[PDB]
């Protein structure tokens, strides 16, 4: 009975991720001193992860366990659209964090007058609008999923769509994240004190470390899938074994559950907020 225990393992992971992301959101919502434009981006990332883990992953696990779609064609389209939207929003909201930290490190003295709350929320809105355009846009212009059997839930088999989605949703934001974090790394390796003060320099070098951990885990989890799927859709004969191609799929979606572990195990204020929220 491989189905039941696999489903139980997956469900445990999804519930763990759901609680982790709710806890991350509450730790920032319920704390006055944690309300900063750079923490609202963490809350946005947690919101995308929470949507993915509470609305998308349960049905993905059921669909893996069963092996077919048991909820009709109408819910297939909605589930696929929400999945793609949340996945694109998560990575673009990580890219916006990369840009925010690059600005806060390169120009630590003008940062309060560059990244204002107005501009920070404008950036959030632009990220979400861009995610909607990149994700839900192509799903209509590239033959919204074709299957005609009411049990198949197959996003566009077209090679063009997978190229655009892979490029737009993984490889364009990854370039910005990696470039911006490298500059943060290079700057932090040359400057004695970032903002002339030791407390500020410490509090800026700690956040950069946490960002590096988040980015490293994200790349590690999501790179195998985006290396193995596009090649499969580009060279038809280079189809890998399904066992490894199932592992890379769930490895990528495990990030939405791991990230709330990254946040408190790297920072000391996030851990305290986690305790203060769990105790209540």
């Amino acid at each position, epitope marked *: 009975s491989k189905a039941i225990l696999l489903g139980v393992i997956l469900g445990g992971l999804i519930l763990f991720g759901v609680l982790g992301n709710i806890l991350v959101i509450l730790s920032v919502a319920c704390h006055r001193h944690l309300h900063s434009v750079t923490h609202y981006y963490i809350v946005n990332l947690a919101v995308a992860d929470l949507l993915l883990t509470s609305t998308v992953l349960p049905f993905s696990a059921i669909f893996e366990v069963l092996g077919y779609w048991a909820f009709g064609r109408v819910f297939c389209n909605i589930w696929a659209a929400v999945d793609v939207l949340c996945c694109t929003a998560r990575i673009w909201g990580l890219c916006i964090i990369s840009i925010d930290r690059y600005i806060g490190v390169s120009y630590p003295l003008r940062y309060p007058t560059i990244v204002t709350q107005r501009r920070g929320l404008m950036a959030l809105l632009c990220v979400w609008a861009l995610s909607l355009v990149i994700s839900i846009g192509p799903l209509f212009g590239w033959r919204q999923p074709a299957p005609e059997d009411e049990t198949i839930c197959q996003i566009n088999e077209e090679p063009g769509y997978v190229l655009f989605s892979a490029l737009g949703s993984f490889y364009l934001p990854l370039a910005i994240i990696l470039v911006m974090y490298c500059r943060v790394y290079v700057v932090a390796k040359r400057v*004695r004190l970032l903002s002339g003060s*030791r407390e500020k320099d410490r509090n800026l*070098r700690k956040a950069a470390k946490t960002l*590096g951990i988040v980015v490293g885990c994200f790349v590690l989890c999501w790179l195998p899938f985006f290396l193995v799927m596009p090649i499969g859709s580009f060279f038809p004969d280079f189809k890998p074994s399904e066992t490894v191609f199932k592992i890379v799929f769930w490895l990528g979606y495990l990030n939405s559950c791991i990230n709330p572990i990254i946040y408190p195990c790297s920072s000391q204020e996030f851990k305290k907020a986690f305790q203060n929220v769990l105790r209540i």
Partner: nanobody
Amino acid sequence: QVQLQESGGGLVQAGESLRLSCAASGTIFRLYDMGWYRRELVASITSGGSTKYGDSVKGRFTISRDNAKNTVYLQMSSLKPEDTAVYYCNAEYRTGIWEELLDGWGQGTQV
């Protein structure tokens, strides 16, 4: 725990020169500002090469730093009867790229 200790001590009468040594030992990611103190500042070098001296030093001293082997030196010149109380070794070190800047002192020397 990074360690910096004095060196080059001894006994001599006025008119002769010395060369104290001080190098960093331990887990260091890099060193930023190094120099000697007498409490009072007598010299200091930054990682770039900007040399500084105290007002009491009328170009008397020459503090030198090697970027390769994490070592500093201080060449003495023209001892004075009332210019030797204690000589410390002060450095600011970082043990990692994502850690706070710290500093350490030395034991001391006298002549």
